[PDB]
């Protein structure tokens, strides 16, 4: 019954390398999620 988000940024076909991801924020959400959609501004 939560929601956790991790982020990472790196300058410059996924690249060859190893990198780790840090948490940002945890959210108490009581509704299960089965489908998700992205958004892009044109």
């Amino acid at each position: 019954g939560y929601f956790k988000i991790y982020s990472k940024h790196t300058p410059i076909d996924l690249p060859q390398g190893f990198s780790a991801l840090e948490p940002l924020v945890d959210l108490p959400i009581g509704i299960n999620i089965t489908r998700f959609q992205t958004l892009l501004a044109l």
């Binding site: 019954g1 009581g30 509704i31 299960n32």
Partner: protein, 48 residues
């Protein structure tokens, strides 16, 4: 509190579920009003 949460007319505010399609997972909430299909064929949104 038997006296402080009752009246001669009664309380119609509280709502509970007689039956439902499937069990609820721990810490999950559902307010959908969909009727479980107890009959052979669905009723398509009308209480039959």
């Amino acid at each position: 509190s038997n006296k402080l949460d009752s009246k001669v007319s009664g309380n119609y505010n509280y709502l509970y579920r007689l039956f439902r399609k499937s069990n609820l997972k721990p810490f999950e909430r559902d307010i959908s009003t969909e009727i479980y299909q107890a009959g052979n064929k669905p009723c398509n949104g009308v209480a039959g």
